[PDB]
Symmetry: C2
Subunit: 167 residues, 2 copies
Amino acid sequence: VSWISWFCGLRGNEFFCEVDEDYIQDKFNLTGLNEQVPHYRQALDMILDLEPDPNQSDLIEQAAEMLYGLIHARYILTNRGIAQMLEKYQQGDFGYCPRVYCENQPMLPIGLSDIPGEAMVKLYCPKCMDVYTPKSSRHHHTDGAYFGTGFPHMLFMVHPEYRPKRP
Amino acid sequence: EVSWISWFCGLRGNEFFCEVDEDYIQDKFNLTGLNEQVPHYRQALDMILDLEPNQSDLIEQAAEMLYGLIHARYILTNRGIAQMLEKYQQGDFGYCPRVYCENQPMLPIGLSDIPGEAMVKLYCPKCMDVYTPKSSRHHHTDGAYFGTGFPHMLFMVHPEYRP
Ligand SMILES: [Mg+2]
Ligand SMILES: [Zn+2]
Ligand SMILES: [Zn+2]
């Protein structure tokens, strides 16, 4: 299986969509990340299933997870990313609002910060418009910066018709 | 041998219940009116009190219902409130999922006082909203066994705990 499909299918990574490798291969989309993660080349090769050009292997795997997360945060602000997250949303992959009166409204992932290492991913309910902590501990080690502070708002700007019927 | 009450409260899914003191149940005046609300009242009460006795199964179900209705009245008394307050301090009922409530402990609450209408929900005194328990193990616990006015009563007696 591809590294991306594998990563996204791991327990705890249910909120991630699979980034189109074509988006990753257009180098301009990754601008700046070359100075934001360790082992940039080896991590990117891993993400793209390229032949690896141990102690180091663990560090490279960690680097790949970080780089993929940062790429993901950018991707979900683009047409493909938004569409894929919208499909996951319709399937309830991110869970449902715990408020009794929101009647299991599906939620969307959101970051309290765009800086890695500041907060773990939270969930935004479009109905009550509040942010919640994931009910499952399997999601408590997923960095919110891989989803971002502006993702839900961008999704609704592009797909206003999904905005809860509570204006 | 373990008491029926300790056995019942220790079962998976019954974590929100406090253990009703026997003396409260032994005072018939506290149980006024319950005989007309559950089947096999006398045998169910004997069972709850560890008193000497398909029918068995139906009586077991009646005892669960009767204990639930007794529990709803008991937790409005100072003793029951104190027991629930201890559980609250330990987080037995869980914490608010709202990020900005900073894991404020919640209390069980019923949306209705009529059995069979709604399962138990959780009330957060910080945001003042009601939530569905995160764990499915609690999704078959009747809210009428906690009641519509329990949280209000607990905070009326112990206002210091209101955020
Ligand atoms: Mg391609
Ligand atoms: Zn909601
Ligand atoms: Zn709250």
